[PDB]
Amino acid sequence: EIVMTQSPATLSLSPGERATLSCRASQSVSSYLAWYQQKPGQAPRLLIYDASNRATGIPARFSGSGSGTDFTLTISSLEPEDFAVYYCQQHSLLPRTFGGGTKVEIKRTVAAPSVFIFPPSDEQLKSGTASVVCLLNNFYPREAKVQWKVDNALQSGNSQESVTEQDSKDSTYSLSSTLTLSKADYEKHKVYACEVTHQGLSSPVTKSFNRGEC
Amino acid sequence: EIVMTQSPATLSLSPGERATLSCRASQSVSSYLAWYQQKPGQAPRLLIYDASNRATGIPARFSGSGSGTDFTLTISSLEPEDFAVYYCQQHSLLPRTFGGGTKVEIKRTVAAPSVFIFPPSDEQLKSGTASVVCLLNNFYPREAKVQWKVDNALQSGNSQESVTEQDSKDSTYSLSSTLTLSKADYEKHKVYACEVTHQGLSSPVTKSFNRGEC
Amino acid sequence: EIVMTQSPATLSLSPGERATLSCRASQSVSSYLAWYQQKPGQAPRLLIYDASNRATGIPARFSGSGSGTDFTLTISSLEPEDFAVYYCQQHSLLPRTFGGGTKVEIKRTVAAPSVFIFPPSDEQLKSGTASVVCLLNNFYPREAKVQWKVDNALQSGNSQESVTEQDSKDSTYSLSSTLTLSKADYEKHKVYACEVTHQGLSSPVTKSFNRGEC
Amino acid sequence: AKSRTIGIIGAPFSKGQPRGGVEEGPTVLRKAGLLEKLKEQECDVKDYGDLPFADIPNDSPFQIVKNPRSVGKASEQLAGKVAEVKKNGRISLVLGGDHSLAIGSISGHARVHPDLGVIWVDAHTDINTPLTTTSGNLHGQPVSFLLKELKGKIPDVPGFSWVTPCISAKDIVYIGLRDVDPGEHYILKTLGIKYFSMTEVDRLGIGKVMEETLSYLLGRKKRPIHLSFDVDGLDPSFTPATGTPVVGGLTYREGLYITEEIYKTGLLSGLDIMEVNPSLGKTPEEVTRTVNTAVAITLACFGLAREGNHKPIDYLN
Amino acid sequence: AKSRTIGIIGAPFSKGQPRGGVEEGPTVLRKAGLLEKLKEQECDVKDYGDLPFADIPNDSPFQIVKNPRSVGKASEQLAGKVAEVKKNGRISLVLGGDHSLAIGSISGHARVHPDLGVIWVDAHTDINTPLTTTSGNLHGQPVSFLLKELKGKIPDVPGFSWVTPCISAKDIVYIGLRDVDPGEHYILKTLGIKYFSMTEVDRLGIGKVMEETLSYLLGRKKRPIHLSFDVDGLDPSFTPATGTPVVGGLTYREGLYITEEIYKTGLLSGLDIMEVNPSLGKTPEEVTRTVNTAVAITLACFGLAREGNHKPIDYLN
Amino acid sequence: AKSRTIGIIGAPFSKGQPRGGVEEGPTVLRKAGLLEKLKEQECDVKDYGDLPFADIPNDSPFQIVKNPRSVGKASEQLAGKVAEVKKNGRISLVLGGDHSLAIGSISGHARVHPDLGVIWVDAHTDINTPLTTTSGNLHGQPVSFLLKELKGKIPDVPGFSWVTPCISAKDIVYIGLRDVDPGEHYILKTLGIKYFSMTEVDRLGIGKVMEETLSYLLGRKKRPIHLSFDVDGLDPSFTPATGTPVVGGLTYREGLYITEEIYKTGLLSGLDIMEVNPSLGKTPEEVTRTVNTAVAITLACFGLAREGNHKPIDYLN
Ligand SMILES: [Mn+2]
Ligand SMILES: [Mn+2]
Ligand SMILES: [Mn+2]
């Protein structure tokens, strides 16, 4: 059970020069591990098969080194179709541990989320529930906060968030914490504010409404 | 783990003609299973040993067929001593799955429960508890409801029911939901109604009292 | 899994004559078990190796008998350095069960605990918690009680006790129940009494204060 | 070649033994892929599918013998199929299933080769009559229908009227006997059938036993040899998932040596692999070992020597 | 018959070995039902119960030898019982327990048959003296009390004053040696005792070894044979629940062949089955295999041939 | 003595086989304490440490042969060390690791003793060329570099330019063949190399096979014998934690008899123990059995007879 530690946790790079990646082993694998291309929603694909040697139709730019504890994966000529979660994985020891995950993002600039809270529908009040949805939209990076305020009461646990993938077009993100409440706790209050703290935001943006306003 | 599904879940038959029963297998047992006579509170007894052939002192009327997925058990000449939970059980596959249970009842007519709620004793009030007992008695079939009402509050969970066996004499049943409460929750209310809904009842019969009446 | 039952649970003896100890087996070990000297905070030490025969530097006084169900351990010439938890342990059956524990105390007389309750610090009120500490000190034996009173409310569960070892000097004990509360439940009350019931005490001694007194 | 020209007959059959599950004998062995494991070396592999065995619900038993008619119909169907595939000049690989199938296997083989011999490798003799049985299970009674010396001693069992006793007492050699009934041992000493129990194998060694076996059967006349095999004759350390597990069986090495000597005769003409029960595996590992054991026995029957095998061309090219 | 006329002696004894649990040797073997497994064939089964062995609490050891007196009292009681049941003309089946019981077993057998011989099947020679021991355990020292050539070399052990050395160095054959002390191997080469370690069995085969064994013991003079057996001489794949597990032992088939050849002599006169420890079973399955192994060894001692056995009457009736 | 004078060479090496973990071969065997298990009997134990094997990152493969240069550097370092310790007059105990180490082992042994012979005990011949391979793994190709008859048939593998073919086709005996390639069996029949597959061992018995082996190698001329051993030739019931588990191997008793006969020659001059993988143990119990098996093989190579061994002085004192 040799722990494989990938030294870049994630990476963001606007498409360009060498974007070399790293994975370390807990023991001496000695050039007996492989590199992988798990694309989002896809089957993984072999990049490097034994610490180098550029497996079977890999284009021009995906060398790597190692031998035998801390291994490298050189993304030299970035080619932005290659934005995928990458994986070192030892093989010549059982059981066969994978790496951690090497989500390669894009580094445009830090942008502000266009924050949009949404009341639950009256159809949801016909369902006897209430889910307040606070948008975040068209921003960078994912490093955000949502602090729900229920007549200005800092609440969580009733709220499930939702992270879009990074867009191919504008490299942005979109969040939605979903403050799912009962209808009874919904009727107890009106001021439903959503304190959103993001780096592109200068302030913790509190997007609010009143129960029955919109 | 071949699932044995008995096609009659239960059965009720006032004593008479062919009362044939059924069990299906999940695979092809091919005449390699047996029939059983678990009487209430008794050890089970072998009826048919291999899909037919009327094992070793079975009287005159207990044939069956099959071979090899869905098997039959013919109760042709009913003989009302034979009211017992019956069982198909595969054998020639491990592990050896039983059937579901074939409680054979008697089909007299649908009767109304004589409903009798009972206050907890003051001796139970000396115990610091309270259990309200609502009878059902001398009815048919078991398909009943009890809706406790505590100053007319539809409650459950504090109530354990109790099902008599079908009588040999009058083929009836008797129920008692036991609304076991604390003494404190007992003292909070008086109107202790027991909404009993049964098929022999024309109405949901609500048998009530007041705390301190009887 | 032969259960080894030591017939003295504990023992207290002011240093003197034969202080013989006992252990019983669930089966016939037949002189195939050993005696041990787990001193407090120490590694155990072999006393008797096979039901007798005085293992390898044991001084003069530690014989024992048995053969083969109920075994003895004779502490004949007490020598008060020998106050340690003692152990029978079968060996010639797997798995190898130990005894129960033979804490040898000292029997001075029954003394009264000098009881001292202590308010939580205001530094603990700066921590947002509160732990009320009620001493017992310089008494005998350990058989005591603490009944916390929070504006005279018999509470427990918020209280962890703490038992000193028997002193080498005066053979005494010291207890401290630690009524750990929230600061909020602390602020709800003042009269923080500690009903201590001990044999050396003639009465259940209730040591109290008020929140903000000392 | 003339050897390793195979007709494969699967018989998902269980009605001659109690414990159902040997119906998945050919299922597991084909999904173990015996075909592809033959197709490396020069094997004329030709499956003929599984046989559709009818389910007669009114299979009324004998006194002790139970299910006579569906078993007899099964072996009659199998006798037709074995005679069919031995008209093709192939080697009749039949595998089930239990020993009741070996009746029709030897029957259809004797329809083509009446001069055959049987090597019945088994923990048991399986020579029981309907009279001298204790269970009545026909997998304990295949051999008695096929012996000419028990003619008249065989009752008229319903479903076995087509059965002709085809071999003599000298025509058969038992190897691996360690679970023999008193009736079985009495008949064995009665007819003077040549055999090899575990005693004589532990005495002489498996090489001397195989030497004396081939000297007894082929030292007189070179004749087609119908190896009919039970997996319980091998030790249940290798084959625990068999219908009749009896400890102290032959070793895996010994059985491989037997089958290699049989291939080196080249007069192997029909193979029967029975009592394969994956449902009696306590672990799937037990099933895996037992199936691999049976497959390796079959491969060494069809040329897979432990010393190695090659196509007769140069490889230093 | 003259053979398989059995006196059964159970000895729930453990005090000659460290690991307690072989007291439930006769308990498990009798609840394995060796009696009923003898009662099919013509066995004059007669149990004589278990022996009440006293517990002397002051069993003061020797230098290295521990518990001399209770073991000596046990073997003296057992010597009386073995001589008693061999006055009955039976075959003394004694089973425990450990090898210290075999002292009194051979003693009471030599009281009736002074011309006996011993086949000591064991992983060990167990020929240790009180001087040449490493443990002092008397189950490692039974044989040295019984050898006339070690007279004077045996110290005066408390509890063994009744012991008379009854056999010579030529009177005993070891089979199964794979755990031999340097003192044991020195004494073995000193007295010139005929033996068969695992080396010579792997060389000659178990048939040639049994042939040479019976040629050495009975080729000179037909004499009563006292097979004294240890279960560890068989391989711990079959017997893992033994007191001294040593890998590389004899196979189950080999031990059955040994006991079958001993029955075919018919001069078997006393059987000793020791080192049966159900408490050393890691699984109950281990206990089950080991007990069934020992029972099958005993049955093949008393006529259960692997080739089959029958009552000498017609069965085709 | 002249025998059991040991130089110990540990090689924590894996690059000639795929499954990493045989680097902890000498680690586990030394922490199994083979040294102390030699030090009871008269063993001149002298370890020489482990060899520092360099990690060449640019070990560019051949067509199918992978990692040629680090393996060649490893065996060249090992050839120097083996020749060094055989200048000391010791017996070169080398243990790894895999069969690629045996190249340099036999190389450095032939630097001192050009007249040697090889007993290659293995499930495999390992005689593959770079051309006739299927994996390209050099533990499947050690023997072909060392044969004079394959000169020219060996391509110029990078890292093996120092390798001199030192033995002839008559100089080597295979024992334990049960997994042989068609290329391997073709070369084996081509050169006429004397061998002993599992077929001939099951025929003749291990005693006759060892007799014919020593008659073939030492019946002509008494010469230094380099036993190079694989643990997979023994059955994986005893050694499941090997790199190439092939069922139907030799028994533990058979391998002990082999090594005892080799010690009784006294012409053993170099021992190679390879394919020891503790990481392939499914349980630590598997690792424990396999390691104890290999250790007991080594002890029986260096005098530990199953019949017993003693210092040649009196013990009755
Ligand atoms: Mn069979
Ligand atoms: Mn022994
Ligand atoms: Mn190998």
Q: Where are the domains of chain F?
A: 1-317
In this structure, what token pair is assigned to residue D88? 């093709």
**Using CA of residue A148, residue A154, residue A158, residue A162, what is the dihedral sign?**
positive
Q: How many Cα atoms within 13 Å fall on the side-chain side of residue C176?
A: 12
Instruction: Give the chain D residue whose CA is nearest to the CA of E254.
Output: D202
Residue A160 touches partner F, C-beta closer than 8 Å? no
In this structure, what token pair is assigned to residue F224? 């230094």
Task: Starting from the CA of residue F141, give the closest ligand.
Answer: 3
> 10 Å Cβ neighbour count for A46?
14
* Ramachandran category for residue B115: left, alpha or beta (phi over 0 → left; psi -120 to 50 → alpha): beta
In this structure, what token pair is assigned to residue D221? 């006349």
Rg (CA), chain C: 22
Could you tell me the CA-to-CA distances from A76 to A79, A94, A100, B127 in Å, in that order? Answer: 9, 32, 21, 82
Distance, C-alpha B180 to centroid of its chain: 23
The yes-or-no answer on residue D275 being catalytic is yes
Residue C70 touches partner E, C-beta closer than 8 Å? no
Residue F128 marked as a ligand binder: yes
> 10 Å Cβ neighbour count for F219?
11
Question: CB of E33 within 8 A of CB of E154?
Answer: no
Resolution in A: 4.0
Question: CB of D249 within 8 A of CB of D72?
Answer: no
Asked if A30 and F57 come within 8 Å (Cβ–Cβ), the reply is no
Q: Which secondary-structure segment (H or E) carries E110?
A: helix E101-112
Secondary structure letter of residue F256 according to DSSP: H
In this structure, what token pair is assigned to residue D314? 């140069």
Asked if D185 and E309 come within 8 Å (Cβ–Cβ), the reply is yes
Question: CB of B148 within 8 A of CB of B132?
Answer: yes
| Spatial separation of the C-alpha atoms in residues F276 and F279, rounded to whole Å | 9
Beta strands in chain F (DSSP E): 5-10, 44-50, 91-95, 117-121, 172-177, 195-197, 225-230, 268-274
* Ramachandran category for residue B104: left, alpha or beta (phi over 0 → left; psi -120 to 50 → alpha): beta
Q: What CATH number does domain D1-317 carry, 3.40.190.10, 3.40.50.300, 3.40.800.10, 1.20.210.10? A: 3.40.800.10
The yes-or-no answer on residue E126 being catalytic is yes
Q: F89: burial class by Cβ within 10 Å (0-12, 13-18, 19+)?
A: exposed
Beta strands in F215-293 (DSSP E): 225-230, 268-274
| Spatial separation of the C-alpha atoms in residues B211 and E225, rounded to whole Å | 93
| Spatial separation of the C-alpha atoms in residues F175 and F208, rounded to whole Å | 12
Coil, helix or strand for D164? Answer: coil
Q: Which residues of D touch E311 (CB under 8 A)?
A: 182
End-to-end CA distance of chain E: 25
* Ramachandran category for residue A128: left, alpha or beta (phi over 0 → left; psi -120 to 50 → alpha): left
| Spatial separation of the C-alpha atoms in residues E252 and E239, rounded to whole Å | 9
| Spatial separation of the C-alpha atoms in residues D294 and D284, rounded to whole Å | 15
Instruction: Give the chain F residue whose CA is nearest to the CA of A53.
Output: F60
Cis geometry, peptide bond prior to residue D165 (ω within 30 degrees of 0): no
Coil, helix or strand for A192? Answer: strand
Coil, helix or strand for B94? Answer: coil
F and A make contact (3+ CB pairs below 8 Å)? yes
Cis geometry, peptide bond prior to residue C68 (ω within 30 degrees of 0): yes
Residue E203 touches partner D, C-beta closer than 8 Å? no
Q: What is the DSSP string of F126-185?
A: ----SSS-SS--TTSSSGGGSBGGGTTTS---TT-TT----B-GGGEEEEEE----HHHH
F and D make contact (3+ CB pairs below 8 Å)? yes
- CA triplet C199, C202, C207: central angle to 5 degrees? 95
Task: Return all residues near C141 (Cβ < 8 A) that are at least 6 apart.
Answer: C12, C105, C110, C173, C199
The yes-or-no answer on residue E235 being catalytic is no
- Which residue of A30, A65, A67 is in closest CB contact with F20? A30
Q: Which secondary-structure segment (H or E) carries D108?
A: helix D101-112
C and E make contact (3+ CB pairs below 8 Å)? yes
Query: Phi, psi at residue D230, to the nearest 5°?
Result: -115, 140
In this structure, what token pair is assigned to residue A147? 């602090």
| Spatial separation of the C-alpha atoms in residues F5 and F8, rounded to whole Å | 10
In this structure, what token pair is assigned to residue B24? 């299906």
Among candidate residues E23, E76, E109, E124, the one labeled active-site is E124
Task: Return all residues near F267 (Cβ < 8 A) that are at least 6 apart.
Answer: F218, F222, F223, F224, F225
Burial readout B20-59 (b: 16 or more C-beta within 10 A, e: otherwise): ebbbbbeeebbbbbbbbbbeeeeeeeebbebbbebeeebe
Q: What protein residues have CB closer than 5 angstroms to ion ligand 1? A: D 122, 124, 230
Q: Which residues of E touch C51 (CB under 8 A)?
A: 57
Question: CB of D107 within 8 A of CB of D100?
Answer: no
Asked if F15 and A30 come within 8 Å (Cβ–Cβ), the reply is yes
Residue B91 Cα, ligand 1 centroid: separation in angstroms? 22
Angle, in degrees to the nearest 10, between helices E69-87 and E101-112: 30
Residue F203 touches partner E, C-beta closer than 8 Å? no
**Using CA of residue E105, residue E109, residue E110, residue E116, what is the dihedral sign?**
negative
Task: Return all residues near A138 (Cβ < 8 A) that are at least 6 apart.
Answer: A111, A113, A114, A170, A172, A173, A174
Q: Which secondary-structure segment (H or E) carries F255?
A: helix F252-265
Could you tell me the CA-to-CA distances from A207 to A130, A191, D21, E285 in Å, in that order? Answer: 17, 10, 68, 70
Beta strands in A10-100 (DSSP E): 11-12, 21-25, 33-38, 46-48, 70-73, 85-90
Task: Return all residues near C39 (Cβ < 8 A) that are at least 6 apart.
Answer: C45, C84, C85
Q: D129: burial class by Cβ within 10 Å (0-12, 13-18, 19+)?
A: buried
| Spatial separation of the C-alpha atoms in residues F222 and D2, rounded to whole Å | 47
| Spatial separation of the C-alpha atoms in residues A89 and A51, rounded to whole Å | 10
Distance, C-alpha A128 to centroid of its chain: 33
Among candidate residues D109, D113, D124, D226, the one labeled active-site is D124
Question: CB of D11 within 8 A of CB of D53?
Answer: yes
- Across chain D, how many H-helices and E-strands are there? 9, 8
Could you tell me the CA-to-CA distances from B159 to B152, B156, B162, B179, E205 in Å, in that order? Answer: 15, 6, 10, 4, 78
| Spatial separation of the C-alpha atoms in residues A96 and A147, rounded to whole Å | 41
| Spatial separation of the C-alpha atoms in residues B123 and E44, rounded to whole Å | 73
Could you tell me the CA-to-CA distances from C112 to C169, C204, F104 in Å, in that order? Answer: 17, 11, 84
Residue F262 Cα, ligand 2 centroid: separation in angstroms? 28
Instruction: Give the chain F residue whose CA is nearest to the CA of A90.
Output: F20
